[PDB]
């Protein structure tokens, strides 16, 4: 049923994932990808396709995701269905995302067609609506990135992986977490603020425009957020960076998304727009 969280037995989860088959799902196995603290497997429970995150050799990431995802339910957030604690290895069960991650769709992994500019604008809007819900409910995601934006059967953006998420009732931490290529200057120093999630969203918007990953060792610049400087110093234009795997992009809406991305990427946290302004600006763009 869709009305309750289901506690599953480890043996049911080991069975529906073909004994946690680590061969890619594209080869006949069950591995869909891997988060920070586990591997995500495709499963079949109640005739339904599900996603199973096996936190193998943790606990803190199990009880966090259960706590955060019991409070946060929105159409632009990934839905948790249940969990497993009995047998050896902790497991988290989710509603399966038929189109995988934004990262995989932007890189056309496994033969998928490139996302149109139209689809890209709707995904940006959906992802911002999910972030707004989290911020309205005093949650800081701390790992906003294209791998953590999932796509359902209608390409509706769903923020996922709330293992590093933080509450509130500004703050500093000794244990710095996140993805360096997406992290704000203050988040790298240890500050905990929702303004850091806005910075990270700015990198995601650049990935949507360009189709380029946030970091690439064989690229100049290595870090995607550095293209903001090349465009500001008139060495390059946004036009030079627009993903060539699209046929429907128009300069005006691309420049309007770039302006939002540029504002999000301000080095001074207080000069960045809040999520409500990001939503407003992405709505005016279409
Ligand atoms: C880490 C984490 C994940 C999650 N969560 C929750 C749901 C899902 C989910 O369903 N995820 C994926 C589905 C995929 C489908 N496909 C097939 C695509 C096709 C046929 C078009 O090629 N590929 C995929 C890849 C992924 C991955 C694993 C990458 O997100 N993940 C939650 C909490 N934390």
CSV table of C-alpha atoms and ligand atoms in Angstrom, one decimal:
chain,number,residue,atom,x,y,z
A,1,UNK,CA,0.0,0.0,0.0
A,2,UNK,CA,1.0,3.7,-0.5
A,3,UNK,CA,-0.4,4.6,3.0
A,4,UNK,CA,2.3,3.1,5.2
A,5,UNK,CA,6.1,2.4,5.5
A,6,UNK,CA,6.8,-1.3,5.0
A,7,UNK,CA,9.4,-3.1,7.2
A,8,UNK,CA,11.0,-5.7,4.8
A,9,UNK,CA,13.0,-8.8,5.6
A,10,UNK,CA,16.6,-8.9,4.5
A,11,UNK,CA,15.9,-12.2,2.7
A,12,UNK,CA,13.1,-10.7,0.6
A,13,UNK,CA,15.5,-7.9,-0.4
A,14,UNK,CA,18.3,-10.3,-1.2
A,15,UNK,CA,15.8,-12.2,-3.4
A,16,UNK,CA,14.3,-9.4,-5.4
A,17,UNK,CA,17.8,-8.0,-6.2
A,18,UNK,CA,19.1,-11.4,-7.5
A,19,UNK,CA,21.4,-11.8,-4.3
A,20,UNK,CA,22.5,-8.1,-4.6
A,21,UNK,CA,23.8,-8.7,-8.2
A,22,UNK,CA,26.6,-6.1,-8.7
A,23,UNK,CA,26.6,-6.4,-12.5
A,24,UNK,CA,25.1,-3.2,-14.2
A,25,UNK,CA,21.4,-3.4,-14.8
A,26,UNK,CA,22.3,-2.7,-18.5
A,27,UNK,CA,24.2,-6.1,-18.6
A,28,UNK,CA,21.4,-8.2,-16.8
A,29,UNK,CA,22.5,-7.5,-13.2
A,30,UNK,CA,20.9,-5.3,-10.6
A,31,UNK,CA,23.4,-2.4,-9.7
A,32,UNK,CA,21.8,0.9,-10.7
A,33,UNK,CA,24.5,3.1,-9.3
A,34,UNK,CA,26.1,3.9,-5.9
A,35,UNK,CA,25.6,6.6,-3.3
A,36,UNK,CA,28.1,7.7,-0.7
A,37,UNK,CA,27.4,4.9,1.9
A,38,UNK,CA,25.9,2.1,-0.3
A,39,UNK,CA,25.0,0.5,-3.7
A,40,UNK,CA,21.5,1.0,-5.2
A,41,UNK,CA,19.9,-2.1,-6.6
A,42,UNK,CA,16.8,-2.6,-8.8
A,43,UNK,CA,14.2,-4.8,-7.0
A,44,UNK,CA,10.6,-6.1,-7.5
A,45,UNK,CA,8.3,-6.1,-4.5
A,46,UNK,CA,4.4,-6.2,-4.7
A,47,UNK,CA,4.8,-6.5,-8.5
A,48,UNK,CA,6.3,-2.9,-8.3
A,49,UNK,CA,9.8,-1.9,-9.3
A,50,UNK,CA,11.7,-0.5,-6.3
A,51,UNK,CA,15.2,0.9,-5.6
A,52,UNK,CA,17.2,-0.9,-2.7
A,53,UNK,CA,20.0,0.9,-1.0
A,54,UNK,CA,22.2,-1.6,0.8
A,55,UNK,CA,24.4,0.2,3.3
A,56,UNK,CA,27.1,-2.5,3.5
A,57,UNK,CA,30.6,-2.8,5.1
A,58,UNK,CA,26.4,3.6,8.2
A,59,UNK,CA,23.6,3.1,10.8
A,60,UNK,CA,23.7,7.0,11.2
A,61,UNK,CA,22.9,7.2,7.5
A,62,UNK,CA,20.1,4.6,8.0
A,63,UNK,CA,18.3,6.4,10.9
A,64,UNK,CA,18.9,9.8,9.3
A,65,UNK,CA,17.2,9.0,6.0
A,66,UNK,CA,14.2,7.3,7.9
A,67,UNK,CA,13.9,10.5,10.1
A,68,UNK,CA,14.3,13.1,7.3
A,69,UNK,CA,12.1,11.2,4.7
A,70,UNK,CA,9.3,10.6,7.3
A,71,UNK,CA,9.0,14.4,7.8
A,72,UNK,CA,9.7,15.5,4.1
A,73,UNK,CA,7.1,14.3,1.6
A,74,UNK,CA,6.7,16.4,-1.6
A,75,UNK,CA,6.2,15.6,-5.4
A,76,UNK,CA,9.8,16.9,-6.0
A,77,UNK,CA,11.4,14.7,-3.3
A,78,UNK,CA,12.2,11.0,-3.7
A,79,UNK,CA,9.8,8.7,-1.8
A,80,UNK,CA,11.0,6.2,0.8
A,81,UNK,CA,8.8,3.0,0.9
A,82,UNK,CA,10.5,1.0,3.7
A,83,UNK,CA,13.5,-0.5,5.3
A,84,UNK,CA,15.3,-3.6,6.6
A,85,UNK,CA,17.2,-4.1,9.9
A,86,UNK,CA,16.8,-7.8,10.8
A,87,UNK,CA,19.4,-9.6,8.7
A,88,UNK,CA,23.1,-8.6,8.3
A,89,UNK,CA,23.3,-5.3,6.2
A,90,UNK,CA,21.0,-2.3,6.6
A,91,UNK,CA,18.7,-1.6,3.6
A,92,UNK,CA,16.6,1.4,2.5
A,93,UNK,CA,13.8,0.9,-0.1
A,94,UNK,CA,12.5,3.7,-2.4
A,95,UNK,CA,10.1,4.3,-5.2
A,96,UNK,CA,12.0,3.5,-8.4
A,97,UNK,CA,13.0,6.4,-10.7
A,98,UNK,CA,12.5,5.1,-14.3
A,99,UNK,CA,14.8,7.7,-15.9
A,100,UNK,CA,17.6,7.5,-13.3
A,101,UNK,CA,19.6,10.6,-12.4
A,102,UNK,CA,20.0,14.0,-14.1
A,103,UNK,CA,23.8,13.3,-14.3
A,104,UNK,CA,23.2,10.1,-16.3
A,105,UNK,CA,20.6,11.8,-18.5
A,106,UNK,CA,22.9,14.8,-19.2
A,107,UNK,CA,25.7,12.4,-20.2
A,108,UNK,CA,23.3,10.1,-22.3
A,109,UNK,CA,24.5,7.0,-20.4
A,110,UNK,CA,23.3,3.7,-21.8
A,111,UNK,CA,22.1,5.1,-25.1
A,112,UNK,CA,19.4,7.4,-23.8
A,113,UNK,CA,18.6,10.5,-26.1
A,114,UNK,CA,19.8,14.0,-25.1
A,115,UNK,CA,17.4,16.0,-22.9
A,116,UNK,CA,15.7,18.8,-24.9
A,117,UNK,CA,16.0,22.5,-23.6
A,118,UNK,CA,12.2,22.4,-22.8
A,119,UNK,CA,12.7,19.2,-20.6
A,120,UNK,CA,15.8,20.8,-19.0
A,121,UNK,CA,13.8,24.0,-18.0
A,122,UNK,CA,11.1,21.8,-16.4
A,123,UNK,CA,13.7,19.8,-14.4
A,124,UNK,CA,15.4,23.0,-13.1
A,125,UNK,CA,11.9,24.2,-11.9
A,126,UNK,CA,11.0,20.9,-10.3
A,127,UNK,CA,14.5,20.6,-8.5
A,128,UNK,CA,14.0,24.2,-7.2
A,129,UNK,CA,10.5,23.4,-5.9
A,130,UNK,CA,12.0,20.4,-4.0
A,131,UNK,CA,14.8,22.6,-2.5
A,132,UNK,CA,12.1,25.2,-1.5
A,133,UNK,CA,10.1,22.5,0.3
A,134,UNK,CA,13.3,21.4,2.2
A,135,UNK,CA,14.2,25.0,3.1
A,136,UNK,CA,10.6,25.9,4.1
A,137,UNK,CA,10.8,22.9,6.5
A,138,UNK,CA,14.2,24.1,7.8
A,139,UNK,CA,16.3,21.4,6.2
A,140,UNK,CA,19.7,21.9,4.6
A,141,UNK,CA,20.4,19.1,2.0
A,142,UNK,CA,24.3,19.6,2.0
A,143,UNK,CA,24.8,17.5,-1.2
A,144,UNK,CA,22.8,19.1,-4.0
A,145,UNK,CA,24.3,17.8,-7.3
A,146,UNK,CA,23.0,16.3,-10.6
A,147,UNK,CA,23.6,12.7,-9.3
A,148,UNK,CA,21.1,13.5,-6.5
A,149,UNK,CA,18.4,14.9,-8.8
A,150,UNK,CA,16.3,11.9,-10.0
A,151,UNK,CA,13.9,11.6,-12.9
A,152,UNK,CA,10.6,9.7,-12.9
A,153,UNK,CA,8.5,8.3,-15.8
A,154,UNK,CA,7.4,11.9,-16.8
A,155,UNK,CA,10.9,13.4,-16.1
A,156,UNK,CA,9.7,15.1,-12.9
A,157,UNK,CA,12.8,16.1,-10.9
A,158,UNK,CA,13.1,14.5,-7.4
A,159,UNK,CA,15.8,15.5,-4.9
A,160,UNK,CA,17.3,12.4,-3.4
A,161,UNK,CA,20.0,11.3,-0.8
A,162,UNK,CA,19.1,13.0,2.4
A,163,UNK,CA,21.8,11.1,4.4
A,164,UNK,CA,23.9,14.3,5.0
A,165,UNK,CA,20.7,16.5,5.5
A,166,UNK,CA,20.6,18.9,8.5
A,167,UNK,CA,17.8,20.5,10.5
A,168,UNK,CA,17.3,24.0,12.3
A,169,UNK,CA,14.8,25.5,14.7
A,170,UNK,CA,24.8,30.6,10.9
A,171,UNK,CA,26.2,27.2,12.4
A,172,UNK,CA,29.7,25.7,12.2
A,173,UNK,CA,30.9,22.0,11.9
A,174,UNK,CA,34.1,19.9,12.5
A,175,UNK,CA,33.0,17.1,10.1
A,176,UNK,CA,32.8,18.8,6.6
A,177,UNK,CA,30.6,16.8,4.2
A,178,UNK,CA,29.5,17.3,0.5
A,179,UNK,CA,30.9,17.2,-3.0
A,180,UNK,CA,33.8,19.6,-3.5
A,181,UNK,CA,33.0,20.4,-7.2
A,182,UNK,CA,29.5,21.7,-6.0
A,183,UNK,CA,30.5,23.2,-2.5
A,184,UNK,CA,30.2,26.9,-1.6
A,185,UNK,CA,33.4,28.6,-0.2
A,186,UNK,CA,31.9,28.8,3.3
A,187,UNK,CA,30.7,25.1,3.2
A,188,UNK,CA,34.3,24.0,2.5
A,189,UNK,CA,35.3,26.1,5.6
A,190,UNK,CA,32.7,24.2,7.7
A,191,UNK,CA,29.7,26.7,7.8
A,192,UNK,CA,26.2,25.1,7.7
A,193,UNK,CA,23.6,27.3,6.0
A,194,UNK,CA,20.8,26.8,3.3
A,195,UNK,CA,22.7,29.5,1.3
A,196,UNK,CA,25.3,26.7,0.5
A,197,UNK,CA,22.5,24.6,-1.2
A,198,UNK,CA,21.8,27.7,-3.5
A,199,UNK,CA,25.4,27.8,-4.5
A,200,UNK,CA,25.4,24.0,-5.3
A,201,UNK,CA,22.1,24.5,-7.3
A,202,UNK,CA,24.0,27.1,-9.4
A,203,UNK,CA,26.5,24.4,-10.5
A,204,UNK,CA,23.6,22.1,-11.3
A,205,UNK,CA,22.1,24.9,-13.5
A,206,UNK,CA,25.5,25.2,-15.3
A,207,UNK,CA,25.4,21.4,-15.9
A,208,UNK,CA,21.9,21.7,-17.4
A,209,UNK,CA,23.0,24.5,-19.8
A,210,UNK,CA,26.3,22.9,-20.9
A,211,UNK,CA,25.8,19.1,-20.4
A,212,UNK,CA,29.4,19.1,-18.9
A,213,UNK,CA,30.2,17.4,-15.6
A,214,UNK,CA,31.0,19.7,-12.5
A,215,UNK,CA,34.6,18.3,-12.6
A,216,UNK,CA,36.6,16.9,-15.5
A,217,UNK,CA,40.4,16.2,-15.1
A,218,UNK,CA,40.9,16.4,-18.9
A,219,UNK,CA,39.3,19.9,-19.1
A,220,UNK,CA,40.2,23.5,-19.0
A,221,UNK,CA,38.8,24.6,-16.6
A,222,UNK,CA,38.8,21.4,-14.5
A,223,UNK,CA,35.9,22.8,-12.4
A,224,UNK,CA,32.7,23.9,-14.2
A,225,UNK,CA,32.0,26.7,-11.7
A,226,UNK,CA,35.2,28.5,-13.1
A,227,UNK,CA,33.4,29.1,-16.5
A,228,UNK,CA,31.5,32.0,-14.6
A,229,UNK,CA,34.9,33.8,-14.5
A,230,UNK,CA,35.7,33.2,-18.2
A,231,UNK,CA,32.3,34.6,-19.1
A,232,UNK,CA,32.7,37.6,-16.7
A,233,UNK,CA,36.2,38.4,-18.1
A,234,UNK,CA,34.8,38.3,-21.7
A,235,UNK,CA,37.2,35.4,-22.7
A,236,UNK,CA,34.1,33.3,-23.6
A,237,UNK,CA,30.3,33.6,-24.0
A,238,UNK,CA,27.5,31.5,-22.6
A,239,UNK,CA,26.7,30.6,-26.3
A,240,UNK,CA,30.1,28.8,-26.6
A,241,UNK,CA,29.2,26.6,-23.6
A,242,UNK,CA,25.5,25.7,-24.6
A,243,UNK,CA,25.2,21.9,-24.9
A,244,UNK,CA,25.4,21.0,-28.6
A,245,UNK,CA,23.3,17.9,-28.0
A,246,UNK,CA,20.1,20.1,-28.1
A,247,UNK,CA,18.3,21.6,-31.1
A,248,UNK,CA,15.6,23.7,-29.3
A,249,UNK,CA,17.7,26.1,-27.1
A,250,UNK,CA,17.1,29.8,-27.6
A,251,UNK,CA,19.6,32.4,-26.5
A,252,UNK,CA,17.1,34.4,-24.3
A,253,UNK,CA,16.0,31.5,-22.1
A,254,UNK,CA,19.5,30.1,-21.9
A,255,UNK,CA,20.8,33.6,-20.8
A,256,UNK,CA,18.0,33.8,-18.3
A,257,UNK,CA,18.9,30.4,-16.7
A,258,UNK,CA,22.6,31.5,-16.8
A,259,UNK,CA,21.8,34.8,-15.0
A,260,UNK,CA,20.0,32.7,-12.2
A,261,UNK,CA,23.1,30.3,-12.1
A,262,UNK,CA,25.5,33.4,-11.9
A,263,UNK,CA,23.5,34.9,-9.0
A,264,UNK,CA,23.5,31.5,-7.2
A,265,UNK,CA,27.3,31.2,-7.6
A,266,UNK,CA,28.1,34.5,-5.8
A,267,UNK,CA,31.1,34.0,-3.6
A,268,UNK,CA,29.4,36.1,-0.8
A,269,UNK,CA,26.6,33.9,0.7
A,270,UNK,CA,24.4,36.9,1.6
A,271,UNK,CA,24.5,38.3,-2.0
A,272,UNK,CA,23.0,34.9,-3.3
A,273,UNK,CA,19.2,34.8,-3.9
A,274,UNK,CA,17.1,32.7,-1.6
A,275,UNK,CA,15.3,29.5,-3.0
A,276,UNK,CA,12.0,31.5,-3.4
A,277,UNK,CA,13.7,34.1,-5.6
A,278,UNK,CA,15.4,31.2,-7.6
A,279,UNK,CA,11.9,29.6,-8.2
A,280,UNK,CA,10.5,33.1,-9.2
A,281,UNK,CA,13.4,33.7,-11.7
A,282,UNK,CA,13.1,30.1,-13.2
A,283,UNK,CA,9.3,30.7,-13.6
A,284,UNK,CA,9.8,34.1,-15.4
A,285,UNK,CA,12.3,32.3,-17.8
A,286,UNK,CA,9.4,30.3,-19.4
B,1,LIG,C1,21.8,7.3,-3.5
B,1,LIG,C2,20.3,7.2,-3.3
B,1,LIG,C3,19.5,6.8,-4.4
B,1,LIG,C4,18.2,6.9,-4.1
B,1,LIG,N1,17.2,6.5,-5.1
B,1,LIG,C5,15.9,6.4,-4.9
B,1,LIG,C6,15.4,5.9,-6.1
B,1,LIG,C7,16.5,5.7,-6.9
B,1,LIG,C8,16.6,5.2,-8.3
B,1,LIG,O1,15.6,4.7,-8.7
B,1,LIG,N2,17.8,5.5,-8.9
B,1,LIG,C9,18.2,5.1,-10.2
B,1,LIG,C10,17.2,4.6,-11.0
B,1,LIG,C11,17.7,4.3,-12.3
B,1,LIG,C12,17.0,3.8,-13.3
B,1,LIG,N3,17.9,3.6,-14.3
B,1,LIG,C13,17.7,3.1,-15.7
B,1,LIG,C14,17.6,4.3,-16.6
B,1,LIG,C15,17.4,4.0,-18.1
B,1,LIG,C16,16.6,2.8,-18.4
B,1,LIG,C17,16.7,5.2,-18.7
B,1,LIG,O2,18.6,3.9,-18.8
B,1,LIG,N4,19.2,4.0,-13.9
B,1,LIG,C18,19.1,4.4,-12.7
B,1,LIG,C19,20.0,4.9,-11.8
B,1,LIG,C20,19.5,5.3,-10.5
B,1,LIG,C21,20.5,5.8,-9.6
B,1,LIG,C22,20.9,4.8,-8.6
B,1,LIG,C23,21.8,6.4,-10.2
B,1,LIG,O3,20.0,7.0,-8.9
B,1,LIG,N5,17.7,6.1,-6.3
B,1,LIG,C24,17.7,7.3,-2.9
B,1,LIG,C25,18.6,7.6,-1.9
B,1,LIG,N6,19.9,7.6,-2.1
